Structure 1
Amino acid sequence: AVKYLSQEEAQAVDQELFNEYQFSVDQLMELAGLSCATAIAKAYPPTSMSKSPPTVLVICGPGNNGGDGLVCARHLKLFGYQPTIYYPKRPNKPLFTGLVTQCQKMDIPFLGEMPPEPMMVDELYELVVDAIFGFSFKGDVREPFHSILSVLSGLTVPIASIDIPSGWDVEKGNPSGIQPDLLISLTAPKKSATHFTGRYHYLGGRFVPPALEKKYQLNLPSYPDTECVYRLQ
């Protein structure tokens, strides 16, 4: 079966992709985000939803996982969803400035604030994307993110988490944490994925070179045809 990575293992793979393999951050974040959008459109196809176009709130955190979310949002728009973004803490870098301007020009709105009650999220948004924290998160959830996570915990609509459910320990999980209905593991799942109790677990990031895969014995499943996602279990 597929290998579930430790936090160290994942940080080592991420290091090689940008070092030995000379991938650019731009690049792999674009493929990551596309997988994310693709898994979401496959698990929650626009046809299956009661609103048209179906609405989605994408919550983007302060780092790279956030960047994935912004990429994910605009492909989701291309796929026929009507996304909305909350992005409260934005790094002051071209990468993220660009990603913001692209979304702004796709007419995707960035909210001024997180809606404060879960009921109000539920009412406006048919799905929530958790793009807050990723694989290199180390455990100190500060405001406004704790607040956001606590609103998410009370939701009735599904949550789709990118790479790891935000607020989970990357290896141990968090039973009192958010419980996403969809998890998109990027490149390979992390050990916290073994505590995943949602219906949908997709693997994404179809860019792992065979030699990187052999070395770390990932045992990736075979992606069908030209798909950038693979549904695990």
Structure 2
Amino acid sequence: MKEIDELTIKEYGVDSRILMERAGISVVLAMEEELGNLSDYRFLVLCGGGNNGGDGFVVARNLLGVVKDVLVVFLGKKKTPDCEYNYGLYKKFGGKVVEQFEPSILNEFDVVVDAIFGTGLRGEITGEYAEIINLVNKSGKVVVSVDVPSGIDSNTGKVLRTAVKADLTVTFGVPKIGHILFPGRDLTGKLKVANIGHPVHLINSINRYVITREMVRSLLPERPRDSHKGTYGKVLIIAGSRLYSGAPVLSGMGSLKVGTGLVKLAVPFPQNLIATSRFPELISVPIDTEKGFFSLQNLQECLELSKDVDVVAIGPGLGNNEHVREFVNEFLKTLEKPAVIDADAINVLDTSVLKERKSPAVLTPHPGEMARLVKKTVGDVKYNYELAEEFAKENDCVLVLKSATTIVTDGEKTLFNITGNTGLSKGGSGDVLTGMIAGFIAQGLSPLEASTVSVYLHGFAAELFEQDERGLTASELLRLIPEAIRRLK
């Protein structure tokens, strides 16, 4: 996007001042849409010395004469040319600026416009920058951040020591990664994305995006009327153990609720019987095991079962011991079908196996699993989209790194999912999503498409829960999936 600004100015010839005017008026219009009539409010505009501040000066100047009061506190040491020009206009128009902040100033104002730092943030915020942000955060006023809340690194969403918490953030052209990943997503509050005059071709050329309702609608497969279950694919799910008997059931129904034609589970006896007692629609094949876990002695039966399906999901509830490790790796090495690899199949995965596979794979780790898989800490991997992209590219797979914002990448294209809520923070949620992805692959979507549609619909189903989200469970999540699908069109 910094390339996008430069190109729009330097190659297309749009004056930088015109972009800056358009930016500031977008903020004014966005506030009006959010606050209603602005004429009864008093505005405190906090401007840095950069272009973010320059945007702020445009906001301030455009409120003059039209609202109850406007004051700018200019907190910088020097001004870029466009900030200087717009400061000059604000003052020519009769605007009041002060350069010294007083704790009590928040008193006489209703709205704070945060134009201190945007994408030009470098390093930790300290000093009077920090103090003013902390005063604004204690103040209880309405906070409107220009571009990105000051203190958020707009490439990562991390807080650089301290950051503004906004009610409303107005950003320009496209959402930035720091509005999408947490903690930044949290501090953004309600995000509006304004068109400020970049050519649409440049806006479209950004290679990381937010998964939207429109994108998922156009990816949903067709349901031709002359169809039968084979039309809609077959999934095998290899899952469960004597310890973890529920996982297979949730994965299997995950596949069925997204429209998959046939679902077969392979689960150790007698735990396989749990699935059909709950949903008799499922086929739950008994696997005779020595001690309640899959082992190499089940390899041959599982490949045989794999022959008559389109996709295999493996891992939920398998347990993690050495016999499971031998099985999972020898199976995936020999299986020539797309695989969705989750949970304990990730915990025991030998990543050399993924490189040698000719058939595709999707991996669905939470950060704990991703951390063990690449031998890093949870904090190194959490929201680390570049690491995710490297991993997907290096191993020829799709990586779905789960969290409140989920990252979906094949190494070239990366998508961010923002649907869902904390009712998904509970055992079982992941098991559902695994089945959904397998299901969509079986119905003919690519591994990346299947993953994109599934993470969106999984989170949207959670939001459709009628009662308090914290009471959501996986079984209720399953029942909500077909409603999410209907609301999607």
Band the TM-score falls in, shorter-chain normalisation: 0.7 to 0.9
Given residue 149 of structure 1, which amino acid in structure 2 is its aligned partner? I
- Equivalences for residues 19-168 of structure 1 within 5 A: 19-46=10-37, 53-77=40-64, 79-89=66-76, 91=78, 95-116=82-103, 120-168=104-152
Deviation at 1:36, TM superposition (A): 1.1
> Are 1:182 and 2:168 counterparts?
yes
Deviation at 1:27, TM superposition (A): 1.2
1:3 alignment counterpart: none
1:200 alignment counterpart: 190
1:173 alignment counterpart: 158
SS of equivalent residue, structure 2 residue 127:
coil
Q: Residues 79, 35 of structure 1: CA spacing in aligned structure 2 closer, same or farther, 3 A cutoff? A: farther
SS of equivalent residue, structure 2 residue 145:
strand
Structure 1 CA distance, aligned partners of 2:29 and 2:23? 10
Deviation at 1:60, TM superposition (A): 0.3
Deviation at 1:213, TM superposition (A): 2.5
Task: Verify the 8 A CA contact 1:122 1:156 in the aligned structure 2.
Answer: no
Q: Residues 79, 204 of structure 1: CA spacing in aligned structure 2 closer, same or farther, 3 A cutoff? A: farther
Larger Rg, first or second structure (1 or 2): 2
Deviation at 1:203, TM superposition (A): 1.2
Structure 2 CA distance, aligned partners of 1:89 and 1:53? 29
Task: Verify the 8 A CA contact 1:11 1:136 in the aligned structure 2.
Answer: no
* Structure 1 range deviating more: 209-218 or 123-132: 209-218
Question: What 5-or-longer segments of structure 2 have no aligned partner?
Answer: 213-418, 420-489
Deviation at 1:26, TM superposition (A): 0.9
What's the Cα RMSD here? 2.7
Give me the TM-score of the superposition, normalised by structure 1: 0.77
Question: What 5-or-longer segments of structure 1 have no aligned partner?
Answer: 1-9, 222-232
Structure 2 CA distance, aligned partners of 1:205 and 1:143? 34
1:215 alignment counterpart: 205
SS of equivalent residue, structure 1 residue 128:
strand
Structure 2 CA distance, aligned partners of 1:78 and 1:217? 42
Given residue 126 of structure 1, which amino acid in structure 2 is its aligned partner? D
* Structure 1 range deviating more: 146-155 or 126-135: 146-155
SS of equivalent residue, structure 2 residue 88:
helix
Q: Which has the higher contact order (CA 8 A, sep 6+)?
A: 1
Q: Residues 210, 92 of structure 1: CA spacing in aligned structure 2 closer, same or farther, 3 A cutoff? A: closer
SS of equivalent residue, structure 2 residue 192:
strand
Deviation at 1:64, TM superposition (A): 0.4
2:373 alignment counterpart: none
Structure 2 CA distance, aligned partners of 1:211 and 1:42? 28
SS of equivalent residue, structure 1 residue 183:
strand
Q: Please list the CA deviations of residues 17-48 of structure 1 after superposition, one character each: whole Å capped at 9, or x if unmatched.
A: 2222222211100111111111112211236x
Structure 1 CA distance, aligned partners of 2:208 and 2:179? 15
Given residue 91 of structure 2, which amino acid in structure 1 is its aligned partner? Q
Bigger helix fraction: 2
Q: Residues 107, 164 of structure 1: CA spacing in aligned structure 2 closer, same or farther, 3 A cutoff? A: same
Give me the TM-score of the superposition, normalised by structure 2: 0.39
Number of residue pairs matched? 206
